[PDB]
Each structure stands twice: as structure tokens, then as C-alpha cells.
Write a protein that binds this ligand. Structure first.
Ligand SMILES: O[C@@H]1[C@@H](O)[C@H](O[C@@H]2CO[C@@H](O[C@@H]3CO[C@@H](O[C@@H]4CO[C@@H](O)[C@H](O)[C@H]4O)[C@H](O)[C@H]3O)[C@H](O)[C@H]2O)OC[C@H]1O
Ligand SMILES: [Ca+2]
Ligand SMILES: [Ca+2]
Length: 165
């Protein structure tokens, strides 16, 4: 049981994602206009996948002004007021030196919590944290920020987002 939808990209056909807002069920991908060299978002079928058969790959070619100018946001995330949740996701990168922040917030852009400038390695690792829905929201969001300068020239892979009571 999880709060989010399509946490492992298994719903989505393999291929480059061109419809960023609606091409991946359960997710909203977004690239801001300050990112002059846009990234490539791809759902990959690979036996490397920690969950199922598929992962999301984000190839970063350039950045903008804020880390969220390249982001993948899980939406909707169905929760209950006052409840504490565990967030877990798996991530790795093509090259050394990647940086990602894993966040959760409300539709008002208020963050309930995050894992900040996580050090992503060339091997799959789990990244986990707890957060509490400290207000009266029931439908929240989980933005992952990839727009760090250190990621230029890298591909970041994510899989198996699970937000659990
Ligand atoms: O989808 C996008 C949303 O993600 C975005 O939300 C804003 C994201 O930035 C937020 O502010 C961040 C909060 O984290 C600060 O870093 C802290 C440093 O200390 C660490 O201990 C702690 O874990 C970190 O949280 C960072 O300085 C600051 O910039 C902001 O509050 C959110 O509103 O909004 C735009 C959406 O498109
Ligand atoms: Ca998967
Ligand atoms: Ca969407």
C-alpha cells in the first residue's frame, strides 16, 4: 500500500517522455525556461531495474537558476492529516558526482520535509526519510529536484518511490 501512483514507472511505455505534465501517470515532470539546454526524461526497460522492469532516467545537459527547474513530481499523493509517512526511493547515476534533493510538500508549495543534496553514486541505493502531514491536506505532491550544476553531463536514474504510512 502506497500513497503515490506508478511509483516505479511500470505503467508507462518505454521511451523518451515528451509530454512532461501528463506523459507519465502519477507524475508531473517540469523543465523551467531558464534551463537553456533541456534534459532528456526517458522511461527505460532494463534488467537493472530495482523494481519491476522499468526506471526513469533524467539526462541533465544544463541547469537553470534553482534546483527545481528540472524536477519530477509525484502527484497525486493521497494522505491523511496528521499522519506520519515513510518515503523511500532508489537512485543511482551514470557518472560519479550527482546531487539530488527528494522532497514532499503541499499544493501550496509548503514542504513537509526533504532529503537535501543527497550524494547519488553509480550504484543503486535507497534514500529514505519520514515526514508528517502537519496541516489538513489530503492530496500532496513529491517533487524530486535534479537541477544541480554538478549533474551536467550525467544521467540520474530513479525507481521505486514508495510513500507508506
Ligand atoms: O515543485 C516545486 C517545489 O518543489 C518548490 O518548492 C520550493 C522548494 O524550495 C524550498 O525551499 C528550500 C527548502 O530547503 C532549504 O534547504 C534546507 C537546508 O537545510 C536542510 O537541513 C533542510 O533539509 C533543507 O530543507 C533550501 O534552502 C530552500 O531553498 C521551498 O520552500 C519550496 O517552496 O516550489 C516550486 C515548485 O515548482
Ligand atoms: Ca520500476
Ligand atoms: Ca501528471
Amino acid at each position: 500500500l502506497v500513497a503515490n501512483i506508478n511509483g516505479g514507472f511500470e505503467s508507462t511505455p518505454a521511451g523518451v517522455v515528451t509530454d512532461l505534465a501528463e506523459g507519465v501517470e502519477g507524475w508531473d515532470l517540469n523543465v523551467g525556461s531558464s534551463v537553456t539546454n533541456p534534459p532528456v526524461f526517458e522511461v527505460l526497460e532494463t534488467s537493472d531495474a530495482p523494481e519491476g522492469n522499468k526506471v526513469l532516467a533524467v539526462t541533465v545537459n544544463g541547469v537553470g537558476n534553482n534546483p527545481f527547474n528540472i524536477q519530477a513530481t509525484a502527484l497525486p499523493v493521497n494522505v491523511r492529516p496528521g499522519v506520519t509517512y515513510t518515503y523511500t526511493i532508489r537512485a543511482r547515476a551514470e557518472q560519479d558526482g550527482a546531487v539530488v534533493s527528494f522532497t514532499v510538500g503541499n499544493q501550496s508549495l509548503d514542504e513537509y520535509g526533504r532529503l537535501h543534496h543527497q550524494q547519488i553514486t553509480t550504484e543503486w541505493q535507497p534514500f529514505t526519510f519520514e515526514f508528517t502531514v502537519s496541516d489538513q491536506e489530503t492530496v500532496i505532491r513529491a517533487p524530486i529536484h535534479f537541477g544541480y550544476a554538478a549533474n551536467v553531463g550525467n544521467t540520474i536514474y530513479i525507481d521505486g518511490l514508495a510513500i507508506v504510512d
